[PDB]
């Protein structure tokens, strides 16, 4: 009967699916093999053929993804990188390519691009940055009391490193030349990008076990010597709101300090016309440093759950009929 | 995408600065993260080298860190390992794979290359 042969085409969907979601299952318990920033937005929707329909992770542009397995190649499995959300099947830029081709041949110009995802550390590294330019007696000494303390309020949890090379120059324009300039520069095996490279190298291995990750990145003085790189950190801006009080302090530290007083103040300025919502992760403007310490500790234990989601309950072998 | 066609070059005894070049086919190179592997004459293929869709992630092996260094241009759907201070143990032949996945095995790469020999004496 044709009746029975659609029974035939649906049983093998089915069954198609069920080994889908058993290896979904298998993959619970798989460590997360890397991580992505999305750069679009992806709506699942109904004609997308997800290896196990209705099991597709929707995201939005500049979410965060950890990646457990390639299920083939139009489809991985992970999880947005959320609390509360679980695996699911995350479509490949193969796939996500085809499905807006299809988008633009249904919808109703004359004359009738980027990719959507960009490999980042498992972990996003946290990046202090202000009040003013690091190197001096104001800003050091507050950053040293919050690396101070994320290492005690997060021991056993927490990777801090020293970042000394400038890894503002780890971003397309410079690591991924296509130049006559750079393919000699790739020659000299003494070129200054080789040990930038190799820190961005070790920055991602360093939060490969999801471990949290901080920097202190000598370099690092404002959000936007990072935004082009694609170490996507969590860029925590600690803030004097008074520049006056600013002035102060630095006078407070001797001639030494009160001689770059000008260049402290124009590196503070700078950070106070970023674009806040667009610009910092965490903005501790607290008065008390125990205020600003629990406000940064909040943040990023919040962030730990994000990335520690509970292990899924297995199903209880005496339901087993054998 | 479906044809990788690896320019690459010879071999040279020491030293050395060779750019090998893998060129693709079809307008879905920037869909395809790609990377370089290499096979010596009695072992198995290792990785070498892997960069990311939009070229702003590279990914090194240990025994290469420093020496090679790999990069793409999606304007011209070619990816290159520029191979600096050349060994012995560098002889093999060099393939590039294109991957829908980031990975470093070679299970988990979707088109493969002919493949170019060097050699270091």
């Known amino acids: 009967s044709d009746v029975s042969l659609e029974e035939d085409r649906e049983a093998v969907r089915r069954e198609a699916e069920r080994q889908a979601q058993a290896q979904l299952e298998k993959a619970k318990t798989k460590p997360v093999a890397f991580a992505v920033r999305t750069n679009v937005r992806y709506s699942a929707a109904q004609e997308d053929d997800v290896p196990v329909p209705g099991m597709a992770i929707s995201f939005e542009a500049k979410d965060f993804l950890h990646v457990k397995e390639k299920f083939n190649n139009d489809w991985w499995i992970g999880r947005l990188v959320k609390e509360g959300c679980e695996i699911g099947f995350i479509p490949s830029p193969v796939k996500l390519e085809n499905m807006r081709l299809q988008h633009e041949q249904r919808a109703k110009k004359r004359m009738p691009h980027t990719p959507p995802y960009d490999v980042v550390p498992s972990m996003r590294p946290v990046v202090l940055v202000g009040p003013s330019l690091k190197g001096y007696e104001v800003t050091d000494m507050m950053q040293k009391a919050l690396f101070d303390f994320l290492k005690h309020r997060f021991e056993g949890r927490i990777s801090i490193t020293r970042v000394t090379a400038d890894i503002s120059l780890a971003k397309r324009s410079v690591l991924n030349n296509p130049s006559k300039h750079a393919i000699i520069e790739r020659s000299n095996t003494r070129s200054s990008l080789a040990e930038v490279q190799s820190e961005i190298e070790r920055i991602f291995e360093l939060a490969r076990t999801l471990q949290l990750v901080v920097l202190d990145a000598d370099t690092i003085n404002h959000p936007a010597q990072l935004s082009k790189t694609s170490l996507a950190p969590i860029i925590v801006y600690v803030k004097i709101s008074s520049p006056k009080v600013l002035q102060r302090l630095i006078k407070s530290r001797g001639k030494s300090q009160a001689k770059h007083l000008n260049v402290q103040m124009v590196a503070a300025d700078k950070l106070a016309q970023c674009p806040p919502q667009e610009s910092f992760d965490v903005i501790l403007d607290e008065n008390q440093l125990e205020d600003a310490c629990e406000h940064l500790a909040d943040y990023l234990e919040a962030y730990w759950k994000a990335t520690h989601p509970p292990s899924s309950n297995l199903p209880n072998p005496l339901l087993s009929r054998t | 995408q479906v044809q990788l066609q690896e320019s690459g070059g010879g071999l040279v005894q020491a030293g050395g600065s060779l750019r090998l070049s893998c060129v693709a086919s079809?307008?879905?190179?920037?869909?395809?993260?790609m990377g370089w592997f290499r096979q010596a004459p009695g072992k198995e293929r290792e990785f070498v080298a892997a960069i990311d869709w939009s070229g702003g992630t590279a990914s090194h092996a240990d025994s290469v860190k420093g020496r090679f260094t790999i990069s793409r241009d999606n304007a011209k759907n070619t990816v290159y390992l520029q191979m600096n201070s050349l060994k012995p143990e560098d002889t093999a032949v060099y393939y590039c794979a294109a991957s829908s996945y980031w990975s470093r095995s070679v299970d988990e790469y979707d088109y493969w290359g002919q493949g170019t020999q060097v050699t270091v004496s």
């Open positions: 079809g307008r879905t190179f920037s869909s395809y993260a």
